[PDB]
Amino acid sequence: VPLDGGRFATSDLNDLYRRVINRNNRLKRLLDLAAPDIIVRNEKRMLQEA
Amino acid sequence: TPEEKLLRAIFGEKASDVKDSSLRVPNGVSGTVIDVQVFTRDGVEKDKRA
Amino acid sequence: TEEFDAIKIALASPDMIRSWSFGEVKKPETINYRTFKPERDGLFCARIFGPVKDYECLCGKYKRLKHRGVICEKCGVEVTQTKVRRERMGHIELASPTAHIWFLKSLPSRIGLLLDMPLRDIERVLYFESYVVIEGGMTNLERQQILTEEQYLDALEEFGDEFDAKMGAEAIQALLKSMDLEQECEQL
Amino acid sequence: GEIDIAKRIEDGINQVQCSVAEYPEAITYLLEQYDRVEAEEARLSDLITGFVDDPELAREKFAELRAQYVVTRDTIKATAQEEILKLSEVFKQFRLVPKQFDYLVNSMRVMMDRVRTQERLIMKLCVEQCKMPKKNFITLFTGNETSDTWFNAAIAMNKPWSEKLHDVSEEVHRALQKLQQIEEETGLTIEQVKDINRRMSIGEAKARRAKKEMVEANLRLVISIAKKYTNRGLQFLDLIQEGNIGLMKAVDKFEYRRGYKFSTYATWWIRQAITRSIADQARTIRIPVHMIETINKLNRISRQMLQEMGREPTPEELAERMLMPEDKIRKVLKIAKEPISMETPIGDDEDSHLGDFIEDTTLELPLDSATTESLRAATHDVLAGLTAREAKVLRMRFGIDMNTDYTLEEVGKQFDVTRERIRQIEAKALRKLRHPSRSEVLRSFLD
DNA sequence: TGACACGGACTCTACGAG
DNA sequence: CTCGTAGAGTCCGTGTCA
Ligand SMILES: [Zn+2]
């Protein structure tokens, strides 16, 4: 919601969802690119964490 | 809503495109206003009272 | 209003989760920042969840109640009362099968105890700390044994086929899918 | 490394090629799809993709395959078998069209799996009563693995579960018979598939190591450049990942023959990716990149002017320093504000957060709902006070107690008198209601 | 914190079998 | 009677309230 004064207030789930979706898209592109094993491992680790 | 449109047609009530927001006195307090201050940002047209 | 009773709770099946959700959220954008209308098809998206303002689509093609069940062709937003924006759930199609933390770390580790495999091992597996030999064919290797990097390396070189080992939530899903519940119940 | 790792990749797949060649009847289908390839309806890279230790060159090499193969094929039944293994290693150079190896490796894998399913039901039978160590299972089962003889060899060792297996004698022989069918399609036994599979894995591992090196060599560089971008709302690890993507992109696109310093090219792409990612996915509300550059300029200018002047530069002074009309200056200042976390605790009262205050303006006021209800009731009865078809006219012209409103021509069609007379009716009704004492009660609804 | 409790893992003692 | 296994107790670390 836009609180009076041009600033915004959001629940944290917005940030969490944004981060998860980012890592998901990055992993998709990484698979399309056939990155070396180490990088796919790191990506899956971070996605699990998120 | 429709019925109110009917009412506007009937009485010819030009709807005012500006809502009221005035800072009215809080409920149940009564006293004397001793002073007023006005702060305009630089650039805007100072009103007479300023 | 229905008069109900008996609240039922169960694991959500993937087909049930797809059943509830009305759309997939592909991009992370939230709102247009110029006019704060929602971005499509972002975390806030009208063509998935619902119209911001009552009974008018996003693009502004249909604004009258005369249009109330029609779905604007330009903006894929259906015209309804904004309250629906409170009830529709969405979904994200996840690329890598991911483990549900609650069923893992809750003191009785139901992934752990279901697998009859210690907890420390499972944490090691999910975070890509070690492999696990998932049904290691005709070799000298167990089915729920965790393997370190160099153990898996000497093994792969040693055992090319009839050798299935994996890492992470994918391996865990593999291990879970193949388990025969009732036969093991009889044995136990 | 790209050419090196590609060579090792081809060497691994070449190893699987050798493994297949050392397997039987593979050479028959092999020569058949070489014959297919001769018509030239495909590419030279579906049959040879880099060697190990032109149509004519392939023709002559395959002529040598045919010759060595057949001459060892006649005397195949001792050393000629080792010569066939050598033919497998020399063909290792060639790789077959993806479909054919997919077909063979998948049929061989699923057959090994199927025999494994039979073996595992046997292993259930053994583990439940006799707990068979796997060594004896292999040794007795491996070596023949083709006829049901091993079954009676299990019967021959006098083991209690092994003899008891007659309960599953039907299924065991069904597995052996289908296994014989797989034998016929290959025309051999199995154990050599074990040899084949180990060589395939060895080759693939070689290729694996090469690909690993294709970043092990340029890894820490990404980390070194990454530590720059370390405060733009981005988990360090995401930064390093974006840098890895950029580095891979550079490597695959790197051109040593175009005349360009390699390292610069790499770092260039690294930045091109990292800055792009921070610009796009850093802020919650994505904002054009040129706008970000505008913010950066503003911030440099503010820093210089502030530290020299001491006080600060007023937006007018900033509008001076840059040629922009300053309307966009304050626009950019408004845009840069990040959303505040809705849970931020309010002062010394960690009981309420900010979320606890925001009010929902959407809600229609109950007062207004009551007014609207009273209004519909009153308008309905007052319409009832007026004539019938005029009342219906007025209801239809508006949405009173009805759905979408039809324009005058359509309502006139509804009465079949379709023309200005309908607005004559509208104006006459309005005129008739103008008279007071009926509408004043509705006059009250104005304010 | 801090008093409690639980779980998992580890150490020490005791019993059955050879 | 000792070795190998079984049982009991303890300790540490985590979860849980204000
Ligand atoms: Zn629209």
The full set of domain ranges for chain D reads: 1-40+54-281, 282-362, 363-444
Q: Which residue has the tokens 């392939």?
A: D58
Cα C36 from Cα C80, distance rounded (Å): 20
Q: How many helices and strands, by DSSP H and E, does chain A display?
A: 2, 1
Cα A21 from Cα A44, distance rounded (Å): 13
Contact D204, D15 (CB under 8 A): yes
Sign of CA dihedral C74, C80, C85, C89: negative
- Identical fold between D1-40+54-281 and D282-362: no
Contact D442, D379 (CB under 8 A): yes
Q: What residues of chain A lie within 8 A of the CB of D355, using their CB? A: 9, 11
Cα C131 from Cα C109, distance rounded (Å): 20
- Determine the CATH number of domain D363-444: 1.10.10.10
Which tokens in the block code for residue D296? 């950066």
Q: C81-91 burial, b for 16+ CB within 10 Å, e for fewer?
A: eeeeeeeeebb
CATH 3.40.50.2300 for the D282-362 domain, yes or no: no
Contact C111, C122 (CB under 8 A): yes
- Architecture in CATH for domain D1-40+54-281: Orthogonal Bundle (1.10)
Cα D105 from Cα D181, distance rounded (Å): 17
Per the omega criterion (within 30 degrees of 0), is the bond before D416 cis? no
How many residues are there in chain D? 447
Are the beta carbons of C160 and D201 separated by less than 8 Å?
yes
Cα D305 from Cα D167, distance rounded (Å): 93
Query: Exposed, middle or buried: residue A38 (CB in 10 Å: 0-12, 13-18, 19+)?
Result: middle
CA angle C169, C174, C180 (to 5 degrees): 130
Cα-to-centroid distance, D358 and ligand 1 (Å): 30
| H helical segments located in D130-190 | 134-141, 149-156, 160-164, 169-186
Contact D396, D405 (CB under 8 A): yes
Main-chain phi, psi angles of D352, to 5 degrees: -120, 145
Q: CA nearest A5: which of C174, D114, D354? A: D354
Cα B33 from Cα A11, distance rounded (Å): 41
Cα D282 from Cα D276, distance rounded (Å): 10
Q: Please state whether strand F lies within 7 Å of residue C27 at its CB atom.
A: no
Q: What is the DSSP letter of D35?
A: H
Radius of gyration of chain C (CA): 24
What is the bridge-based pairing of β-strands C165-166 and D340-341? unpaired
Contact C171, C125 (CB under 8 A): yes
**Which of D241, D284, D337 is the closest to A43 by Cβ?**
D241
Query: Exposed, middle or buried: residue D175 (CB in 10 Å: 0-12, 13-18, 19+)?
Result: buried
The bases of strand E with some atom under 7 A from any protein CB are 6-9
**Which of C30, C140, C161 is the closest to D134 by Cβ?**
C140
State the nucleotide closest to C106 in CA–C1' terms: F15
Phi-psi domain of D138 (left: phi exceeds 0; alpha: psi -120 through 50; beta: other): alpha
Radius of gyration of chain A (CA): 16
Minimal CA separation from D327 to chain B, in Å = 12
Cα C106 from Cα C110, distance rounded (Å): 8
- How many CB atoms within 10 Å of residue D340? 13
Contact C172, C129 (CB under 8 A): no
What is the bridge-based pairing of β-strands A9-10 and D340-341? parallel
Q: Please state whether strand F lies within 7 Å of residue C105 at its CB atom.
A: yes
Radius of gyration of chain B (CA): 19
Q: Which residue of D has its CA nearest to A24?
A: D238
How many residues are there in chain C? 188
Residues contacting D276, CB < 8 A, separation 6+:
D289
Contact D278, D286 (CB under 8 A): no
Q: Which residue of D has its CA nearest to B2?
A: D399
CA angle B4, B9, B15 (to 5 degrees): 65
Half-sphere exposure of C131 (CA within 13 A, CB side): 21
Q: In Å, how far are A7, D247, D345 from A2, measured between CA atoms?
A: 7, 40, 19
Q: Which residue is nearest to nucleotide E7 (CA to C1')?
A: C107
Q: In Å, how far are B6, D196, D201, D207 from D11, measured between CA atoms?
A: 84, 15, 12, 7
Cα D349 from Cα D357, distance rounded (Å): 14
Cα D403 from Cα D396, distance rounded (Å): 9
Sign of CA dihedral D161, D166, D171, D176: positive
Q: CA nearest D202: which of A4, C163, C134, A8? A: C163
Sign of CA dihedral A32, A34, A36, A40: positive
Interface A–C counts its CB contacts (< 8 A) at 42
D48 touches chain B (CB under 8 A): no
C171 touches chain A (CB under 8 A): no
Half-sphere exposure of C142 (CA within 13 A, CB side): 6
Q: What is the DSSP letter of D406?
A: P
Q: CA nearest C158: which of C145, C181, C176, C141? A: C141
Q: In Å, how far are C164, D69, D150, D210, D409 from D137, measured between CA atoms?
A: 20, 35, 10, 37, 93
State whether residue C131 is helix, strand or coil: strand
Half-sphere exposure of D409 (CA within 13 A, CB side): 0
Contact C146, C132 (CB under 8 A): yes
Q: Report resolution (Å) to 1 decimal.
A: 4.1
Contact C57, C77 (CB under 8 A): yes
- How many CB atoms within 10 Å of residue C162? 20
Cα-to-centroid distance, D360 and ligand 1 (Å): 26
Phi-psi domain of D271 (left: phi exceeds 0; alpha: psi -120 through 50; beta: other): alpha
Which tokens in the block code for residue C44? 């806030």
Q: In Å, how far are B31, B32, B38, B39, C66 from B35, measured between CA atoms?
A: 12, 9, 10, 14, 55
State whether residue D41 is helix, strand or coil: coil
**Which of C25, C98, C169 is the closest to A21 by Cβ?**
C25
- C185 annotated as belonging to a binding site for a ligand: no
Interface A–D counts its CB contacts (< 8 A) at 69
